[PDB]
Each structure stands twice: as C-alpha cells, then as structure tokens.
Amino acid sequence: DPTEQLAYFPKITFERLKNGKLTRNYMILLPWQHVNRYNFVFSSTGCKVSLKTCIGKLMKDLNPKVLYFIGEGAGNWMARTACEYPDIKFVYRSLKDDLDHHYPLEYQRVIGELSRIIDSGEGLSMETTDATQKTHWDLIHRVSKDALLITLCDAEFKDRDDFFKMVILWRKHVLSCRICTTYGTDLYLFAKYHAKDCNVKLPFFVRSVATFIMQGSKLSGSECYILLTLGHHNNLPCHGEIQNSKMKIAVCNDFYAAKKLDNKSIEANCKSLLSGLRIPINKKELNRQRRLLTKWLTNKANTIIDWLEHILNSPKGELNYDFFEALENTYPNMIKLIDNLGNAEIKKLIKVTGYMLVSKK
Numbered sequence: 001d002p003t004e005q006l007a008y009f010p011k012i013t014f015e016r017l018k019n020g021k022l023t024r025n026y027m028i029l030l031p032w033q034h035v036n037r038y039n040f041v042f043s044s045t046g047c048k049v050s051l052k053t054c055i056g057k058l059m060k061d062l063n064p065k066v067l068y069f070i071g072e073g074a075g076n077w078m079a080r081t082a083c084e085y086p087d088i089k090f091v092y093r094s095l096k097d098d099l100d101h102h103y104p105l106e107y108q109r110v111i112g113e114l115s116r117i118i119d120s121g122e123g124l125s126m127e128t129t130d131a132t133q134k135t136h137w138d139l140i141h142r143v144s145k146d147a148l149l150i151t152l153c154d155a156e157f158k159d160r161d162d163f164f165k166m167v168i169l170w171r172k173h174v175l176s177c178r179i180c181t182t183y184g185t186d187l188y189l190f191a192k193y194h195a196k197d198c199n200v201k202l203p204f205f206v207r208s209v210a211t212f213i214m215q216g217s218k219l220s221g222s223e224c225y226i227l228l229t230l231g232h233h234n235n236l237p238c239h240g241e242i243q244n245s246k247m248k249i250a251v252c253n254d255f256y257a258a259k260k261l262d263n264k265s266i267e268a269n270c271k272s273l274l275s276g277l278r279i280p281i282n283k284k285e286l287n288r289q290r291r292l293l294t295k296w297l298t299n300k301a302n303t304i305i306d307w308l309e310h311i312l313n314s315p316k317g318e319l320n321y322d323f324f325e326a327l328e329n330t331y332p333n334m335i336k337l338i339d340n341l342g343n344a345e346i347k348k349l350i351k352v353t354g355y356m357l358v359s360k361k
C-alpha cells in the first residue's frame with residue numbers, strides 16, 4: 001500500500017518565494033542534510049523535495065493522470081510522489097551513462113514493483129535519455145498520450161548551459177507537440193537549479209512562478225527548485241536571494257524525523273557503511289566490531305567505529321545545524337575522518353548517525 005510507505009518519508013521544511021543580510025558560518029565538514037534519510041538506500045531526494053508539500057494546490061487543480069520525471073536517477077522523488085498520489089502513473093527518464101542509475105532502483109525498492117511506471121525508458125539510447133537532446137523530447141509520448149501538465153526535472157547537469165538547453169527544449173516541445181498544444185499553455189516544469197549570477201534571464205516565453213528553498217539542500221550549495229510556466233520571461237534567482245532564505249531555515253528550523261522506522265532499510269544502510277553492522281547500535285555492538293578487527297580497510301572501519309562511538313557517547317539534542325556543529329567540534333579526529341572516508345561513505349555515515357540520534361532517549 002503506497003499510503004503506508006509515506007510514514008517512512010520525513011516531513012519537509014522549505015520557503016516559497018513568489019515572483020538586511022543574515023549570515024551564520026556553521027563550522028561543519030559533513031553532509032548533515034542526510035541526517036533524516038536513514039530509511040532510503042540508493043537515493044533519497046524525496047526526503048528533501050515533495051510535490052504534495054510544495055505544489056499541492058497545482059497538483060489538485062491540474063489533476064494529472066501521468067507525471068513526467070526527467071533526470072530522475074534511482075527515483076526516490078518519484079517514489080514519494082507515488083505514495084502521496086496512489087492513482088498517478090509515471091513516465092521516467094534519466095541519462096543512460098553507467099555513472100549513475102538510469103533504472104529507478106529506489107522506486108522499485110520503496111513501491112515494490114514498476115506497474116505504475118508506464119514508460120521507464122526501455123530500449124532508449126544515451127541521446128534519447130538526455131534532457132538536453134531534442135530526440136529525448138520527441139520520444140516522450142511513445143507510451144503516454146497525456147500532455148506534459150507537470151514535468152519534474154532533478155537532473156544534475158555536467159555544465160551550467162545544459163539547464164538552459166533543457167528549458168528551451170521543454171518550451172519547444174510544449175509549443176509544437178500536437179498533444180501538448182491541444183491542452184494549451186497552462187503547462188509546468190518544476191526543475192532543480194543552482195543559483196549563481198543575477199540578471200540571468202530565462203529563455204524567451206518561459207516564466208518563473210515561484211522559487212523553493214529546501215531545508216534538505218546542501219548547506220554550502222545554492223540549490224533551489226523553480227516552478228516554470230509559459231509566459232513573458234523573468235529572471236532566474238541569484239545566489240544572494242537564495243542565501244538569506246537558506247540561512248533562516250538552517251538557523252531557525254529542526255529537521256523532522258520520519259514518523260516510522262524502516263528496519264530493513266536502516267539495516268541495509270548500516271551493512272553498506274560497515275559490513276556486518278547490526279541494529280541496535282550500542283556499546284556491545286561497537287565493541288564486537290572492534291573485536292572482529294583483531295590495513296586500509298581496517299583503518300576505514302576504525303574511523304567509522306570511532307565516529308559511531310562519539311555519537312553514542314554524545315548527549316541528545318535537536319536535529320539542527322547548531323547541534324551538528326557541536327557534534328563535529330567535540331570530535332578530535334574530524335580532519336582524519338574527512339581524509340579517510342570518501343563522499344559516498346560519509347553520506348552513509350550521516351544516515352546511520354541520524355538513525356542513532358533519533359533512537360536516543
């Protein structure tokens with residue numbers, strides 16, 4: 001039942017900016033945005049962004065039967081959407097390159113099966129899975145004959161110019177396509193954007209309706225989600241506007257823990273971080289992991305156990321950046337930890353840390 005899987009997803013905090021300076025330098029080196037993402041394995045974007053939370057009214061008003069997810073990788077965002085809207089069908093696209101997922105592995109794990117994905121991009125070439133290519137847009141209706149009422153794009157492009165290439169092709173499709181033109185101009189593209197320079201105009205006849213600043217976005221970044229439509233063009237958000245909104249959330253809000261614990265998922269993340277790690281993670285479990293060690297792999301294992309021991313011995317606090325800064329700055333081996341563990345391992349470490357923090361008291 002998709003509605004029961006929704007309790008594994010944490011509540012989202014965000015700010016909507018419809019179309020003084022606040023600063024706080026958090027002395028953090030870890031990707032703490034994954035703190036409440038312990039229930040998800042291959043991807044976890046759904047813990048950060050949600051269609052019901054951000055564009056609930058638009059979802060209700062347009063009432064799409066089919067949603068188009070492009071640059072959707074393992075499909076966790078699509079999976080949360082499938083839990084929020086149990087009757088909606090999906091068209092999935094993601095760049096086929098073998099660097100990331102081009103099959104919705106996380107959607108499959110969360111939902112159980114792919115019956116609601118009517119088009120998963122089976123038999124498509126690298127070119128026809130690429131959102132910056134015209135052929136990708138020309139083949140978007142090979143299964144679904146429903147107009148692109150709402151298109152979702154979470155693609156992380158190799159170059160900044162690729163975002164514009166994608167937006168131009170979305171506009172060229174919705175203004176040419178027999179299916180989409182028949183529906184009209186009330187069509188939307190909800191896309192991930194990294195805010196940089198100001199006075200950067202959107203392509204001709206592409207208009208931003210709102211800018212969404214998510215609590216779950218990387219603190220050092222400038223990521224945001226823009227709701228785009230057809231109409232007289234305006235400017236993209238710049239780094240400055242996004243910083244104030246993002247700093248307020250970081251300073252004032254706590255991360256919500258998921259209502260329910262997904263034990264199979266938590267165990268899958270624990271074993272992925274340290275092979276053989278069991279739940280509950282206590283003094284007994286960490287001493288057992290230490291005893292198994294008695295090399296490069298043992299050095300990495302010791303670094304992990306030392307951090308989990310520090311979390312175990314740490315006092316309980318609220319899930320916020322002030323507490324995260326305290327956790328890092330009370331740990332004497334911080335620089336050795338970031339030096340020893342890679343980006344993927346550190347991300348797994350934060351999910352497991354988050355599970356431990358939520359489990360306290």
Ligand SMILES: Nc1nc2c(ncn2[C@@H]2O[C@H](COP(=O)(O)OP(=O)(O)OP(=O)(O)O)[C@@H](O)[C@H]2O)c(=O)[nH]1
Pocket residue numbers: 030031032033040041042043044045048216217218219221223343344347
């Ligand atoms: N490798 C990996 N990436 C994930 C996983 N779950 C989510 N992500 C990524 O994490 C992102 C969360 O947004 P951010 O905080 O903006 O990004 P980031 O580039 O992942 O972050 P940092 O780890 O802080 O460098 C998602 O959009 C995904 O790209 C996961 O299990 N593994």
Ligand SMILES: C[S@@+](CC[C@H](N)C(=O)[O-])C[C@H]1O[C@@H](n2cnc3c(N)ncnc32)[C@H](O)[C@@H]1O
Pocket residue numbers: 043044045046070071072073074075076077078093094095100101106129130131132154155156157158162
């Ligand atoms: C942030 S991940 C998407 C995560 C997804 N929302 C989830 O919940 O699993 C970004 C994805 O964009 C893909 N991508 C990168 N460039 C792309 C392009 N040109 N066209 C389509 N997808 C692209 C990457 O392969 C990657 O899977």
Ligand SMILES: Nc1ncnc2c1ncn2[C@@H]1O[C@H](CO)[C@@H](O)[C@H]1O
Pocket residue numbers: 155156157158159160163192193194195
């Ligand atoms: N969705 C996007 N919106 C804006 N810029 C992007 C996007 N994806 C990647 N980039 C930019 O591409 C650059 C090179 O990978 C990065 O510095 C990043 O800012």
Ligand SMILES: [Zn+2]
Pocket residue numbers: 141147148173174177178179180181
């Ligand atoms: Zn169309």
